[PDB]
């Protein structure tokens, strides 16, 4: 378990600074929810260990909070429309004479596609990808330590 405090989250994300706009219980609830996506079991053998894992959890809480304020604020005609506003990465946008076309993320999976919808999710996806190099190896025993080798090594 990882204890979540308002102070680190608020100075990490200055947009979420107003207690009135973002109550403490809302942040705590979204931290509990993000615990399911990334387990907060802190171990020294994990690739996500310590402050890196805490940063990952904080970025996901920012992601969920961004979706939530998108939902509550809307806005269609002064409220929330039917079916809500869907997330996802804005590939191309056009307002007036201004047009923007951005590169699409390599989202090959639903989790990655949902992450790419918000920059906090993009933060989390980048951190997970950069920590996800190599892999694990389950099972197996030191079979080689019972056989003599060059230079009198592991006789």
């Amino acid at each position: 378990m990882v204890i979540f405090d308002e102070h680190k989250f608020r100075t990490l994300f200055p947009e979420f600074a107003d207690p009135a706009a973002y109550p403490d219980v809302r942040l705590q609830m979204y931290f509990d929810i993000a615990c399911e996506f990334i387990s907060d079991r802190d171990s020294p053998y994990r690739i996500l260990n310590g402050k890196a894992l805490e940063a990952c959890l904080y970025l996901l809480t920012a992601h969920l909070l961004s979706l939530s304020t998108m939902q509550v604020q809307g806005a269609a005609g002064g409220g929330v429309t039917a079916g809500g506003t869907q997330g996802g990465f804005i590939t191309s946008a056009t307002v007036g004479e201004v047009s923007v076309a951005k590169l699409a993320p390599p989202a090959k999976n639903g989790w990655q596609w949902w992450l790419s919808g918000t920059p906090y999710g993009q933060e989390l996806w980048a951190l997970l990808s950069v920590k996800a190099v190599g892999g694990f190896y389950i099972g197996g025993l030191p079979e080689r330590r019972g056989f003599r080798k060059v230079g009198g090594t592991f006789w």
Partner: protein, 59 residues
């Protein structure tokens, strides 16, 4: 008796060649006979690499 040790110092004293019986290896040539301390070519020198290769391949 060229390049044939006349005496052998074992413990201080020098035993004569005729007093003792010397058995030596394949008797290397003269120019590098002193390099073998006037002895012979050792079978350990002949098989410390071949034996290692055989044992490591067996491993």
């Amino acid at each position: 008796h060229f390049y044939e040790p006349d005496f052998w110092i074992i413990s201080g004293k020098k035993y004569h060649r005729s007093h003792l019986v010397v058995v030596r290896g394949p008797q290397p040539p003269d120019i590098l006979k002193p390099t073998y301390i006037f002895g012979g070519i050792p079978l350990t020198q002949r098989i410390y690499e071949r034996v290692y290769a055989a044992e490591r391949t067996a491993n």
